Amino acid sequence: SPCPQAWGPPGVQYGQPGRSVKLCCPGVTAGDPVSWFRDGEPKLLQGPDSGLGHELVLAQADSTDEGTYICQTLDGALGGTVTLQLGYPPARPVVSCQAADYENFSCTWSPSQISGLPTRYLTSYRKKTVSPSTGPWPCPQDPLGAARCVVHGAEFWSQYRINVTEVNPLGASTRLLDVSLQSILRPDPPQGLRVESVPGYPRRLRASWTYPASWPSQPHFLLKFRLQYRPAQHPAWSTVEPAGLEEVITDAVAGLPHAVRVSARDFLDAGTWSTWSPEAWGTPSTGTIPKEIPA
């Protein structure tokens, strides 16, 4: 009530170019008539007996009206100085969510258009399930000043609606984003990829790996893998779809280093394929003994 100023520089009030702006006197009791002067231009805009009291409207806001305004009551107790800044209402920000595991996902946002004014963001979400919409829950934003809100302990089968609202001293703009955890899931590549030789088989390479650290322990959703191997300086990749955490190649060239890389995906074909793991190199076993003699 006592001259509601929005978040920003202390002593500034905001408006939109081409529209009509309304200034307010800070140190007033809502009704005490005041006088308005543009500093440097002694032409009084509105006198005390103006009709609307402690505030001031401007017909057509432009850069010539943007500046410093002084309001003082009749008594002689100066309410304060008000600076007019011009800008635009907020536009619906660009929101994009993602997930590395089936339990927690995180969303990011960015303003779709510059407003030029100090801006904050409200983040919320609600489950649509499938029974109906649950109450709105906050999307806790990331600390350290990051534009990122996280959702923890999410339901894999439910469907969410993320609400990112961009707010500046001229209004708000809401961007809703329907998000289903089954669609945005993309795990991290598997770790600990090892390409080993097999004793007694000069054409075999044992490739073993593990689940990524991003996949939680004791999972209810497993991962199916897809492995690609390729001999040294060959152009074509050979794609095999293994079962489990192992794949015994039987097509390797004897005495040639092979490059192997894997990718993961939810076993129910849900989401997309993980990015390719870093390439691991391996050479088949050498079992022919050296130094022969006659017999």
Ligand SMILES: *[C@@H]1O[C@H](CO)[C@@H](O[C@@H]2O[C@H](CO)[C@@H](O[C@@H]3O[C@H](CO)[C@@H](O)[C@H](O[C@H]4O[C@H](CO)[C@@H](O)[C@H](O)[C@@H]4O)[C@@H]3O)[C@H](O)[C@H]2NC(C)=O)[C@H](O)[C@H]1NC(C)=O
């Ligand atoms: C997306 O999110 C945005 C922001 O999170 C949201 O816009 C905001 O919605 C809230 C909730 O309706 C608005 O808050 C209202 O504010 C008015 C004016 O101050 C109040 O009168 C309302 O209070 C009533 O309810 C209270 C709760 O019980 C009572 O205690 C109180 O006595 C009143 O009865 C209410 O709080 C808010 O004004 C907007 N705008 C903002 C924050 O800029 C938007 O609706 C969301 N869109 C979705 C979910 O689709």
Ligand SMILES: *[C@@H]1O[C@H](CO)[C@@H](O)[C@H](O)[C@H]1NC(C)=O
């Ligand atoms: C999801 O959040 C929980 C907190 O309840 C945390 O223990 C878990 O590690 C998070 N998931 C991942 C992949 O980090």
